[PDB]
Design a binder for this molecule. Structure first.
Ligand SMILES: Cc1cc2nc3c(=O)[nH]c(=O)nc-3n(C[C@H](O)[C@H](O)[C@H](O)COP(=O)(O)O)c2cc1C
Ligand code: SF4
Ligand code: SF4
Ligand code: SF4
Ligand code: FES
Ligand code: FES
Ligand SMILES: [K+]
Lengths: 430, 213, 44, 263
């Protein structure tokens, strides 16, 4: 297949994405969820992990690691300690609001994903770390989990397969760093959400020091559909090593900001002009697009004309795919103010543990706040580049990378706007 | 805004805090969610429960959470100062949280912040003199396609204009409670010019299922 | 009938401040007994 | 035995499994710059000064916390190792106060010394620095938390060795502060050793404060008599007068600590 996009409703995994049908158990069973789940559980861990490896599923959290290869790290004999699937439902990324839609509107799909993914890795129970701001969504998922316990679908003898599997919901308390997998593990254990160093990987020492896989809501929720519909079905979409469907959040300066499911290797221009109603003022009004939420570098309108929205096409476009949260910016935007507000987010959401992010993200906020006004000189652009390169690859977790990359994208594509900002500051304030 | 504590006559370790007995049963249900030997994993939900009971966290809710979980009090102070939901000062009865990150800022959340300020007569961080509203400015609330939006104590009020949020503040001053959703025509997150997808009836169970399963 | 014009998630207009915790208290009985590390805390 | 072979700058060395990169470099006599690593405390990994290149790996690893694999070549003096060290020293000195003349750590400071050895020679920092509220933890440890570089040897000492669990980090981000969060008086029997293991002048000895300076003292290696443990001590004298007392390392007695009566 050379042309991607144009995804039909028979291939949509996340039916009832929009809340237009009953999210409860009598609705979810009538849309395909909890069908033949005992037959999925009785085919063992290795069949389910083979169906995830064959489907080419990659992690929807922002890292994009291959999900079957990740989950097979737990496929190992027990050593006394329990094993825990942990669902990352924090979703603090700016632009990203899709896991809220999964939990609020398709909760039993998340519960069945917890059951199937926990059987695949031999997990005892599932701790879903939901965002604490998502209170109505948490109680929504809790009504669904009570409906799945009272139907015998989870718990003692889950789905009648002779497997014991609990599903828990742990509410966070307002920290974006608790979406990082080790910091989320630290927050379940009752501490500050501060990330761990690796090694040990969570599959060795995770939550409570047990073996643990942390996975996104979306990569967990698609796993029963990957089991039922087959891996080759899900791998028939997108490019090779970019297999499947994907929830895309288009927001910012579009006419109809929306969450939408779409095929993987869709063009970005086709996605915006088909599901969002175009950029406000037409496509000629486009300035830049942050492709995948705040941690990815922006790409200008010349790059967004022919770019494809999967992992490899955006890595070759010197940016990332991330959570696939499309922030659209028009020509009426102060782009330095937007990236400075984004760096202000990254210093107000940073746990302060290691030196490069703790000191340098605040120092990048100060340099970006001087770049907005223009109170700077053009040597400081390359100075800020070198500060961002000192933060990148030196921190404990990837909030340093995710705070250095917007600065790098802004400099790399919009150095002339910074320079003309500073020189008009100089010729009107001196 | 400070991360040290000083004992005031309304916030000291002899400020009266205690859980209600139904909240003690809720704390029992919370602590049973975590493995034995790891009772310290219930620090966040019990401290959120204490904030839900009391409205805010004095330094006796922190000491009571440290007392009923057998953890050091400094290890509860760390959690209470780390996470930005734990109100260590008494906030108003309706805690308005305007998002001003870039997906809400591009869709003009500054006009909503200005509308709430000139409606209440306060600024960012202040509390109204009758202790009904505390307006602070928060980061990404996770409702980005519904930008711009606020949060009022549990509830997301979305797709807002200045008129919508002024109507919300009107009916919160009137003792009523508003409906937590998008204040435009659409329901949750769909394209506002009709559904661009999911219009067909969904298939139901048995569709596309591979053989031998 | 098939309906697509109404929003079926109207239940969260009635959630109180203790809805999550009462659902946890209701789910307290359906669960398996937690594994123990053998000690009462890592300070025991 | 089960010793694996690692290379430190090409030099072969046989280490036990579970040996960190830092200890592997120590076994050939290279001391990696560290601020939060302490051999008697738990490993934190949160100052990033020990970042070292392993060749054929496109990322520096924290040598204090990274267990070695077989056949790694550790490059302690490579180009990107030195760039990592200079960058991390730059971030440590971004918000650090210009207090070295009025500071009791001057001349015996880790931050000064391995800034001279591994850091750059000038600043690119052009902003206003933070200033931290000072804490009060008793009549022994003078507390100037503006100098705190947030390495958490405080907290790991008082947690694991002193067994007190009353120091910690409050806040988040660059506003993260080390302290007790309340007006608490950290009075252990081993409380003066946080003056030893604080690498900076954030925790200084209040009785010793301002009276002397490390380069002018004479180190007399002597013995405690305040109990029957027999802690080996250094009696630093300056011009015929005793200035302070510091521990000596003796693994069999006092490993490198002394008590507050002794100190
Ligand atoms: C600062 C930061 C925030 C993150 N936030 C989230 C998040 O909110 N949700 C999420 O699924 N992954 C998040 N991640 C990625 C996780 O570390 C991890 O990759 C993911 O949760 C689980 O892997 P998966 O993509 O296979 O699901 C975050 C990572 C970082 C560094
Ligand atoms: S990168 Fe930033 S958020 Fe993450 S551990 Fe380091 S200081 Fe904390
Ligand atoms: S702690 Fe060290 S670097 Fe800091 S002011 Fe004192 S002597 Fe100077
Ligand atoms: S006061 Fe000293 S030992 Fe304590 S965390 Fe700060 S720099 Fe480290
Ligand atoms: S940007 Fe305001 S909710 Fe995400
Ligand atoms: S010494 Fe290894 S990071 Fe502090
Ligand atoms: K010191």
């Amino acid at each position: 297949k050379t042309s991607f996009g144009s995804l039909k409703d028979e291939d949509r995994i996340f039916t009832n994405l929009y809340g237009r049908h009953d999210w409860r158990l009598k609705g979810a069973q009538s849309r395909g969820d909890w069908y033949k789940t005992k037959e999925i559980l009785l085919k063992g861990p290795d069949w389910i992990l083979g169906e995830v490896k064959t489907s080419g599923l990659r992690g929807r959290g922002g890292a994009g690691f291959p999900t079957g290869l990740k989950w097979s790290f737990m496929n190992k004999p027990s050593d006394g300690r329990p094993k825990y699937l942990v669902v990352n439902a924090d979703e603090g990324e700016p632009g990203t609001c899709k896991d809220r839609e999964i939990i609020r509107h398709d909760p039993h799909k998340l519960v069945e994903g917890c059951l199937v993914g926990g059987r695949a890795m031999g997990a005892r129970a599932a701790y879903i770390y939901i965002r604490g701001e998502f209170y109505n969504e948490a109680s929504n998922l809790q009504v669904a989990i009570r409906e799945a316990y009272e139907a015998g679908l989870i718990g003692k003898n889950a789905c009648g397969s002779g497997y014991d599997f609990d599903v828990f919901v742990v509410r966070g308390a307002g920290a974006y760093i608790c979406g990082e997998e080790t910091a989320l593990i630290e927050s379940i254990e009752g501490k500050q959400g501060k990330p761990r160093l690796k090694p040990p990987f969570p599959a060795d020492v995770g939550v409570f020091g047990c073996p643990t896989t942390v996975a996104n809501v979306e990569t967990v929720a698609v796993s029963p559909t990957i089991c039922r519909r087959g891996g080759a079905w899900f791998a028939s979409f997108g490019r090779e090593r970019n297999s499947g469907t994907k929830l895309f959040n288009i927001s910012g300066h579009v006419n109809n900001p929306c969450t939408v499911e779409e095929e993987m290797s869709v063009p970005l221009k086709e996605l915006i002009e088909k599901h969002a109603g175009g950029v406000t003022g037409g496509w000629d009004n486009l300035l830049a697009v942050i492709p995948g939420g705040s941690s990815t570098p922006l790409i200008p309108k010349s790059v967004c004309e022919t770019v494809l929205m999967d992992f490899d096409a955006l890595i070759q476009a010197q940016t990332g795919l991330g959570t696939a949260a499309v922030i659209v910016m028009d020509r009426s935007t102060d782009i330095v103010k937007a990236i400075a507000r984004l760096i202000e987010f990254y210093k107000h959401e940073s746990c302060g543990q290691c030196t490069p992010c703790r000191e340098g993200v605040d120092w990048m906020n100060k340099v970006m706040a001087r770049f907005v006004r223009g109170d700077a000189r053009p040597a400081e652009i390359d100075s800020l580049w070198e500060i961002s390169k000192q933060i990148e690859g030196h921190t404990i977790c990837a909030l340093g990378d995710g705070a250095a990359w917007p600065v790098q994208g802004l400099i790399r594509h919009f150095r002339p706007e910074l320079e003309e900002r500073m020189q008009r500051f100089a010729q009107q304030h001196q | 805004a400070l991360f040290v504590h000083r004992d005031t006559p309304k916030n000291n370790p002899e400020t009266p805090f205690d859980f209600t007995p139904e909240n003690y049963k809720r704390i029992e249900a919370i602590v049973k969610n975590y493995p034995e030997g790891h009772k310290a994993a219930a620090v966040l939900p019990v401290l959120d429960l204490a904030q839900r009971q009391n409205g805010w966290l004095p330094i006796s809710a922190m000491n009571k959470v440290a007392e009923i979980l057998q953890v050091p009090p400094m290890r509860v102070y760390e959690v209470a100062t780390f996470y930005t939901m734990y109100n260590r000062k008494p906030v108003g009865k309706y805690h308005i949280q305007v998002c001003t990150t870039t997906p809400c800022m591009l869709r003009n959340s500054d006009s909503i912040l200005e509308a709430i300020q000139k409606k209440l007569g306060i600024k960012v961080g202040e509390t109204t003199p009758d202790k009904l509203f505390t307006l602070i400015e928060v980061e990404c609330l996770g409702a980005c396609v519904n930008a711009p939006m606020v949060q009022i104590n549990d509830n997301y009020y979305e797709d807002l204009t200045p008129k919508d949020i002024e109507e919300i503040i009107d009916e919160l001053k009137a003792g009523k409670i508003p409906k937590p959703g998008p204040r435009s025509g659409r329901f949750s997150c769909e394209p506002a010019g009709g559904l661009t997808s999911l219009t067909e009836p969904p298939k139901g169970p048995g569709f596309g299922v591979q053989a031998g399963l | 009938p098939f309906d697509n014009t109404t929003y079926k998630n109207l239940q969260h207009h009635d959630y109180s401040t203790y809805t999550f915790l009462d659902l946890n208290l209701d789910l307290s009985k359906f669960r398996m007994p937690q594994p123990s590390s053998g000690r009462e805390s890592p300070r025991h | 035995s089960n010793l694996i072979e690692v290379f430190v700058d090409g030099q072969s060395v046989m280490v036990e499994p579970g040996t960190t990169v830092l200890q592997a470099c120590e076994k050939v006599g290279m001391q990696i710059p560290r601020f939060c690593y302490h051999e008697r405390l738990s490993v934190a990994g949160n100052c990033r000064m020990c970042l070292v290149e392993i060749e054929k790996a496109p990322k520096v690893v924290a040598a204090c916390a990274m267990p070695v694999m077989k056949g790694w070549n550790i490059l302690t003096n490579s180009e990107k190792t030195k760039k990592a060290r200079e960058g991390v020293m730059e971030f440590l000195l971004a918000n650090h106060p210009l207090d070295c003349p009025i500071c009791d750590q001057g001349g015996e400071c880790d931050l000064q010394d391995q800034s001279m050895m591994f850091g750059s020679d000038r600043s690119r920092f052009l902003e206003g620095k933070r200033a931290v509220e000072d804490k009060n933890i008793g009549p022994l440890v003078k507390t100037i938390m503006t100098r705190c570089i947030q390495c958490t040897r405080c907290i790991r000492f008082a947690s694991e060795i002193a067994g007190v669990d009353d120091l910690g980090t409050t806040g988040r981000g660059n506003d993260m502060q080390v302290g007790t969060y309340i007006e608490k008086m950290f009075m252990s029997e081993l409380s003066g050793n946080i003056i030893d293991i604080c690498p900076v002048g954030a925790l200084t000895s209040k009785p010793y404060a301002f009276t002397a300076r490390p380069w002018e003292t004479r180190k007399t290696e002597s013995i405690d008599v305040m109990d029957a443990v027999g802690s080996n001590i250094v009696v630093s004298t300056r011009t015929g007068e005793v200035m302070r007392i510091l521990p000596r390392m003796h693994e069999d007695i006092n490993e490198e600590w002394i008590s507050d009566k002794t100190r």
